Amino acid sequence: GDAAKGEKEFNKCKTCHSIIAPDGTEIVKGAKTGPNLYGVVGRTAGTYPEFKYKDSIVALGASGFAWTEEDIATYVKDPGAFLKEKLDDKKAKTGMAFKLAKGGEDVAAYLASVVK
Numbered sequence: 001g002d003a004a005k006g007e008k009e010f011n012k013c014k015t016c017h018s019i020i021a022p023d024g025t026e027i028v029k030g031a032k033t034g035p036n037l038y039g040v041v042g043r044t045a046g047t048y049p050e051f052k053y054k055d056s057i058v059a060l061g062a063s064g065f066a067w068t069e070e071d072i073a074t075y076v077k078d079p080g081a082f083l084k085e086k087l088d089d090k091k092a093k094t095g096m097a098f099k100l101a102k103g104g105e106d107v108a109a110y111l112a113s114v115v116k
């Protein structure tokens, strides 16, 4: 995927999320209603500290799931469906109220990039 493009596309995410490095550096100063995305790639889902996630995503991580660019790219398009399928639960609910139409892989790549 394209990171250069992903950064530009992150415009749909900053409304709720931010990209903040461990020493506090503000890579992307966004909102605090969604968890910090710095390092999400490789991270077990629904585990960022001091963040109150909806249940399903926490269950997904409890099952051993860590995000990849690929899944990130997919989830982003339809979070709730993503979950229902992963969890094999028709009843899986998402706390993320946005579906991105096009851009997943790029945004996915960007996110991977950010920690280099």
Ligand code: HEC
Pocket (backbone or CB within 6 Å): 009, 010, 012, 013, 014, 015, 016, 017, 033, 034, 035, 040, 044, 045, 046, 047, 048, 052, 053, 054, 057, 072, 076, 093, 094, 095, 096, 097, 098, 100, 107
């Ligand atoms: C607010 C209306 C949001 C926008 C815009 C975006 N995201 Fe989001 N995201 C939001 C919430 C409330 C949460 C927590 C989910 C839950 O059910 O509790 C999330 C979560 C994610 C995650 C999962 C993070 C984890 O630690 O597992 C990812 C990977 C994610 N969001 C990506 C993402 C992207 C790429 C966005 C922009 C295109 C984006 N989100 C926007 C809320 C909101």
